[PDB]
């Protein structure tokens, strides 16, 4: 059992090496900074087209269009300034639990219990949205997908693996295999040279899409990690888990900085997102409302409480003007 | 206050019309979540019905459109995607009667049935319970006592008694007997009787859901 115990003997020295860098806590550092005000966002828009629970949404890079997937078999693309439905794509499988909108805006992606990542072309010579590609390599439910560009996409799946595809050929050019539980969430770095994946083994892993290897593992949580998102700097990220706790990990420090939890919250987090400056952490809970946390002081800044069911998805625009919450009550709400 | 935004609004309203029509069409479907602890039994009932992830079988019985979702190809954590089937009309649970001597296997069937029946997502969704391989349990008990699975079972090992004991041992697993019903059928050789039983069980589930919708129950 030599090489079966050298593993935790390396784990002990990883812990001892990342404990020597813990000289002052993020609380001790950001103690003297002024707390944010009372973050009181009023709902500005309500999107009322979906007929079943909404499982995912994603903003466009123009901060106006947004795609949302619901288990009524629909993928609706909304113009959020006017609540106009730009598109309504009917999916081959109603069991969709993720969606992504390409940075160029030409393509959207969806996936779920069918084990397929469907890439839909929005801008065709005809007037309809066409199924551009179907990526069919995963053996477990596909829980997240994120476009790198028009040709590459990274998907996370319930077969405990992530994958980097190229859409033109339809094969996956890289597979990321470190997790031991279902990979539930995925976030791309701002430069798209790295990405974090949070799984059901209560861990997040930092992968690099070029060399296709795991660089760091973060193991602070106690239950399944459902959401993950980089800090806008790209040098940190935040995870939300089923243990009713969000928390911030730093890549360079290789450990945890802050824990965002309250006694009154005993419900898991379904979605996590950062403000444009990164000062506010938006966490969607399944106690029917979203919480706004002071990311630097762990103070609970505000509550967004307009939904009648679980808040399943959350996203802040690229210009930081608004935050869209999609819930299981079949409604999307824009807050500002 | 609108120049060609008017045409975009008209397109959005047409999309809304199409979405409403699709929703009304889908609300007439009967969705059945097909569960079990092995495809040996589940595979023989999809053949009874009219003709890689989730497998949807769409068929029509007596001008009723059933969509039956078999999810046994998902070797993932069930708790992470089972809530997708919260609004399913019914659950068709298939257990084999002949796995009371195999490996312990009947006890795993019970574990799965108890985990599914007592979810927080299936508090109202009733269960159609199929006891498959009626003809193998028929002649197994002559040469294999039932007590290998049920040490506390005191009774003759005749089919009519030993099968009813299993049926009660399964119907005594739901902790909520006032919100859902378990419809139990002993899967028979005949082609049409199983789908007739499913049709009858779905008719009750629809009647009891309508009584709740109309505020009478």
């Amino acid at each position, epitope marked *: 059992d030599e090489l079966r115990q050298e593993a935790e003997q390396l784990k002990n020295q990883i812990r001892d090496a990342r404990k020597a860098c813990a000289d002052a806590t993020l609380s001790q550092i950001t103690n003297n900074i002024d707390p944010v005000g009372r973050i009181q966002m009023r709902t500005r828009r309500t999107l009322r087209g979906h007929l079943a629970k909404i499982y995912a949404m994603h903003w466009g890079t123009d901060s106006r269009l947004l795609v949302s997937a619901s288990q009524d078999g629909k993928l609706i693309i909304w113009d959020s300034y*006017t609540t106009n439905k730009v598109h309504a794509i009917p999916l081959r499988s109603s069991w969709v639990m993720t969606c992504a909108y390409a940075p160029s805006g030409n393509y959207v992606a969806c996936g779920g219990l069918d084990n397929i990542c469907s890439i839909y072309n929005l801008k065709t010579r005809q007037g309809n949205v066409r199924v551009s590609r179907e990526l069919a390599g995963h053996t477990g439910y596909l829980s997240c997908c994120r476009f790198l560009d028009d040709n590459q996409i990274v998907t996370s799946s319930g077969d405990t693996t992530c994958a980097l595809w190229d859409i033109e050929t339809g094969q996956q050019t890289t597979t990321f295999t470190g997790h031991t539980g279902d990979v539930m969430s995925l976030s791309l770095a701002p430069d798209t040279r790295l990405f974090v994946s949070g799984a059901c083994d209560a861990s997040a892993k930092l992968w690099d899409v070029r060399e296709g290897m795991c660089r760091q593992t973060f193991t602070g949580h106690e239950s399944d990690i459902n959401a993950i998102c980089f800090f806008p700097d790209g040098n940190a990220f935040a995870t939300g888990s089923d243990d009713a706790t969000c928390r911030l990990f730093d890549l360079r420090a290789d450990q945890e900085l802050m824990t965002y939890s309250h006694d009154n919250i005993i419900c898991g987090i379904t979605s996590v997102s950062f403000s444009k400056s990164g000062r506010l952490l938006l966490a969607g809970y399944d106690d029917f409302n979203c919480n706004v946390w002071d990311a630097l002081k762990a103070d609970r800044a505000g509550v967004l409480a307009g939904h009648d069911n679980r808040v399943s998805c959350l996203g802040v625009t690229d210009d930081g003007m608004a935050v869209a919450t999609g819930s299981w009550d079949s409604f999307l709400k824009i807050w500002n | 206050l609108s120049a060609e935004d008017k*045409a975009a609004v008209e397109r959005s309203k047409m999309i809304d019309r199409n979405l409403r029509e699709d929703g009304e069409k889908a609300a007439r479907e009967v969705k059945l979540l097909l569960l079990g602890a092995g495809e040996s039994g589940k595979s023989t009932i999809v053949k009874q019905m009219k003709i890689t992830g989730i497998v949807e079988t769409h068929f029509t019985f007596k001008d009723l459109h059933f969509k039956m979702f078999d999810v046994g190809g998902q070797r993932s954590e069930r708790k992470k995607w089972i809530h997708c089937f919260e609004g399913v009309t019914a659950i068709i649970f298939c257990v084999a009667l002949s796995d009371y001597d195999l490996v312990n296997r009947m006890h795993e069937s019970m574990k799965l049935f108890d985990s599914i029946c007592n979810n927080k997502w299936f508090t109202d969704t009733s269960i159609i319970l199929f006891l498959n391989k009626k003809d193998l349990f028929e002649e197994k008990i002559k040469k294999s006592p039932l007590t290998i699975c049920y040490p506390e079972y005191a009774g003759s090992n005749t089919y009519e008694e030993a099968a009813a004991y299993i049926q009660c041992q399964f119907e005594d697993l739901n902790k909520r007997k006032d919100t859902k019903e378990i419809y139990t059928h002993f899967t028979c050789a005949t082609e049409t009787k199983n789908v007739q039983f499913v049709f009858d069980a779905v008719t009750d589930v629809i009647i009891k859901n309508n009584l709740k919708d109309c505020g009478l129950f």
Partner: single-chain antibody, 232 residues
Framework: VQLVESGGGLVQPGGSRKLSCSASGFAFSSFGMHWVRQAPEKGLEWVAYISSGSGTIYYADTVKGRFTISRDDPKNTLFLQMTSLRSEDTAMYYC??????????????WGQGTTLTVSSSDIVMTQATSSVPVTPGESVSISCRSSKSLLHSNGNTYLYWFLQRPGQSPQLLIYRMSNLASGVPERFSGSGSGTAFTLTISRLEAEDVGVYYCMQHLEYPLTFGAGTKLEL
């Protein structure tokens, strides 16, 4: 994508005709459709419009009452029934597809046109020039001027630039005053503010020669500029 127009021909002044437009290669049901005439040796004149789903219909005041535009989606046909034809309805009629959503490119495809020969508060878009001589390689600017300001409160200016090459149907170059249509080379650039607009060709080729039309889509009836032609 393809639109084929049929039905035109020699008519007596007072008679009636039925022009048809068979669509092919695109989702005809999702596209609003326009009839746009062009009189012999004159410029484009918008005739009629029927929306997707036939829920909205507009006519030019010179054809309101006489012409009726209809649409039968399952066989993908657009109809213009023209009654009480008079000697100045003689023209070539183009069938134009036009889709309207956020970021869409309306007026993107034009049919080949069918010739009709009837025998014997609007926004005024002004193209001050009528014809300019060009040499391949050099840049050129075409100026359009509107009576009302085409800039709207929602931020986008509704100016469209089309090019009609000799012997061909018009081709959309620029939509909403600054956006290049798909398939248009990047030599063309549209600028302007409110009432004065410019189209710039960075370097002329043998395939940029033709008549350039500016159109307003701020409000109906859609009006065109007189058209100024590049020529070698």
């Amino acid at each position: 994508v393809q639109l084929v127009e049929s039905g035109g021909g020699l008519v007596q002044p007072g008679g009636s005709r039925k022009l048809s437009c068979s669509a092919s290669g695109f989702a005809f049901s999702s596209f609003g459709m326009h009839w746009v005439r062009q009189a012999p040796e004159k410029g484009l004149e918008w005739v009629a419009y029927i929306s997707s789903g036939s829920g909205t219909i507009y006519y030019a005041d010179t054809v309101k009452g006489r012409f009726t535009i209809s649409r039968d989606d399952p066989k993908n046909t657009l109809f213009l029934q023209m009654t009480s034809l008079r000697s100045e309805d003689t023209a070539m009629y183009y069938c134009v597809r036009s889709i309207y959503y956020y970021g869409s490119s309306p007026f993107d495809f034009w049919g080949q046109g069918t010739t009709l020969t009837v025998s014997s508060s609007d926004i005024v878009m002004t193209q001050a020039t009528s014809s300019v001589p060009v040499t391949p390689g050099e840049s050129v600017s075409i100026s359009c001027r509107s009576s009302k300001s085409l800039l709207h409160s929602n931020g986008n200016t509704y100016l469209y630039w089309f090019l009609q090459r000799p012997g061909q149907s018009p081709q959309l170059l620029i939509y909403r005053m600054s956006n290049l249509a798909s398939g248009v080379p990047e030599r063309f650039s549209g600028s302007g503010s409110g009432t004065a607009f410019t189209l710039t060709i960075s370097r002329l080729e043998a395939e940029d020669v033709g008549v350039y039309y500016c159109m307003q889509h701020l409000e109906y009836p859609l009006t065109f500029g007189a058209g100024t032609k590049l020529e070698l």
